[PDB]
Every structure is written in structure tokens, then in C-alpha cells.
Design a protein around this ligand. Structure first.
Ligand SMILES: Nc1cc(N)c(/N=N/c2ccc(S(=O)(=O)Nc3nccs3)cc2)cc1/N=N/c1ccc(S(=O)(=O)Nc2nccs2)cc1
Ligand SMILES: [Cl-]
Lengths: 163, 166
């Protein structure tokens, strides 16, 4: 048997006004089915009919969904990204100075917003952000949001700065 | 001053092809560890070859590392390639033929190093064709070396397998 991977909608993607501080558009759990039952392997974002997640979560596997089978459209192993059904749509960038919110969706746990200041690390062309928190395996792909609710990164990836 | 990580490496084993694998600071393979208020966690893996430590850029964010020898400074780094080398230029130049089985020398957090023989898939990227290992391991296994039959490192787990022609 090949791995039976599917997505389930977990909630809306919204900035939460008083967060904790350290089918349709939304945030989805990426699940695997075994005879013994289901495991969450990651998270992703449906935007403009395109499902976005990390390449390591699916390794280009087709996904079952409420809308039928989703086939991979584009991916990059090095950036660790993959899109289903169409081109990559998550084009927002972090300004490199505003606090962000991680919309963490860990396995077997409630979706929640956590406000956090990314770390900044120097690169040769500039700087990149990091949200490295203590979340369980399977949280990778959780969206990182700016104050307008735009997805500026996925949990486990560097947060790209444009400034 | 700014954001910093307290990172260190620990040798996990020799890098060798294992003749009868399951089929689905000396040179060697190392765990990359980070010290946080919660404790020390493995965040990835890398390869010491010819006195140069090699890992994926995102594992270390290009940070200096502590080792048995003292401080290792990043020498070369590329966020786009997601690679970084310490102490000297990138030394891992072997490529996959695009058809032979390979071995992942997986070094997962809290688990023994082990060799798994597998056949990479081949995927189209804007740069060209690349191989990729279709085995699932936890995030902190990223950087584990992928080996050809002569024990040469032809890729790092999560970074793809380099194909000799395009
Ligand atoms: N100054 C430098 C000093 C170094 N020590 C160094 N090492 N480099 C490596 C590059 C690739 C690989 S690898 O694939 O073989 N991965 C693995 N091999 C075994 C295990 S993993 C390994 C090492 C690179 C340097 N500069 N490099 C540049 C590369 C590209 C471009 S580019 O503009 O042309 N963009 C692109 N186009 C198509 C693709 S990238 C500009 C500059
Ligand atoms: Cl890989």
C-alpha cells in the first residue's frame, strides 16, 4: 500500500487581538491513514483554491480532501515548499520589525494564536526571521501571520524579510 | 548584538555503506544540538569531511558551533541552496547517477544512526532535476547524509540528491 494522505479543515486564519504572548480558504491538518487509525504529519494553508504546505510533510504525495483528490502542482525540496492545484499564492513578506502570530495547529490539540517576535539572523544578501518554539512533531506548516492576517511564513521555515 | 542560538555538535558515527542494509573531531556524521531554556534538542545532522563541517543552512541559521575542537565559524553559506560549511569550503562534491539505489544514514533525535537502502524519486525544480528521499523521519534528522555504493555523500536528507547531469 502507498501512504493514504488527506487534509481536514481546522479553522479560519485570523489575527487574534489579545493572543497569548511568548474546500474553503483556511488552515488544514495534513493526516495519514493507517489500519490502526490516523496521524497528523503537518499543517497547511488553503488560499485561492491552492493548498500550501511543506515539501517534507507530503513528499509530493497526492492528497484526499472534501473537494476530491488534489495533485501537486509545484514544489521545491530546498525551500521545503509544495503547492497543490495551482501555483504558489502565499506572497506576503514580513517587514522584519512587527510582531507576528503563529497559528499553531499541533496534532490532537486546539488551533491557537501565539504572538511572538521572530529572531533575526544575518545572511549574505540580508537577514531572515526564525520562529523556533517548542511545538510537537506534526505542527510544521502552521501559518505565521502579520497584523492583517496575511501568511508571511510556515512554521519550520525561515521567515523571509523584505526591507 | 542580536538574536543568537547556543549550538553544538556531537559525533554520532562513521559514514559507510552497509552491505546488507534493510531495502525499502574526526571525519564522520554529527548531531547538531541547540541548548534552550527547556533543554538540549537535536535540530539536525551534518557531515565532517576533510576538516570541514557541512549541514543545511536552516539547521544552524549560519551560527557558529561549539565542537570538541572549540569554536567552528561558518566559512560559506547560501540560504537559497540551504547549505553551510564550517572551517573551509564545501567539500561534498559527489553526485548520484540518477538510477542506483542509495543509502540514507539516518541519525534521528534520540535514536541510533542506521543505514536504510532506498531509491530516490526524481522531481523537476526550476534549477533542473533533483532526487529526493521518500522516507519520513522527524525534522531533527534533516542533514543526515545520503550515500552512494562507495560511501560518498551524494545528498543531505531534506536537501535532495544531486544528479550528475543537469
Ligand atoms: N562561493 C562559493 C563557495 C562554496 N564552498 C560553494 N559550494 N557550493 C555548492 C553548490 C551546490 C551543491 S549540491 O547541489 O551538489 N548539494 C550537495 N552535494 C553533496 C551533498 S549535497 C554543493 C555545494 C558555492 C559557492 N558559490 N556557489 C554558487 C552556486 C550557484 C549560483 S547560481 O546563480 O547560478 N544559482 C543556481 N542555478 C542552479 C542551481 S543554483 C551562484 C554561486
Ligand atoms: Cl532528500
Amino acid at each position: 500500500s502507498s501512504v493514504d494522505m488527506y487534509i481536514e479543515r481546522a479553522g479560519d486564519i485570523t489575527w487574534e487581538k489579545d493572543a497569548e504572548v511568548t474546500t474553503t480558504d483556511g488552515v488544514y491538518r495534513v493526516m495519514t491513514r493507517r489500519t490502526s487509525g490516523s496521524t497528523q504529519v503537518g499543517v497547511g494553508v488553503m488560499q485561492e483554491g491552492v493548498f500550501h504546505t511543506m515539501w517534507h510533510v507530503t513528499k509530493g504525495s497526492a492528497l484526499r480532501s472534501g473537494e476530491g483528490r488534489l495533485d501537486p502542482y509545484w514544489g521545491d525540496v530546498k525551500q521545503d515548499l509544495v503547492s497543490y492545484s495551482g501555483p504558489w499564492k502565499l506572497d506576503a513578506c514580513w517587514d522584519g520589525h512587527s510582531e507576528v502570530q503563529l497559528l499553531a495547529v499541533p496534532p490532537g490539540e486546539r488551533a491557537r494564536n501565539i504572538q511572538t517576535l521572530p529572531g533575526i539572523f544575518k545572511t549574505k544578501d540580508g537577514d531572515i526571521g526564525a520562529v523556533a518554539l517548542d511545538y510537537p512533531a506534526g505542527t510544521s506548516g502552521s501559518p505565521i501571520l502579520d497584523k492583517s492576517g496575511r501568511v508571511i511564513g510556515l512554521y519550520g521555515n525561515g521567515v523571509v524579510i523584505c526591507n
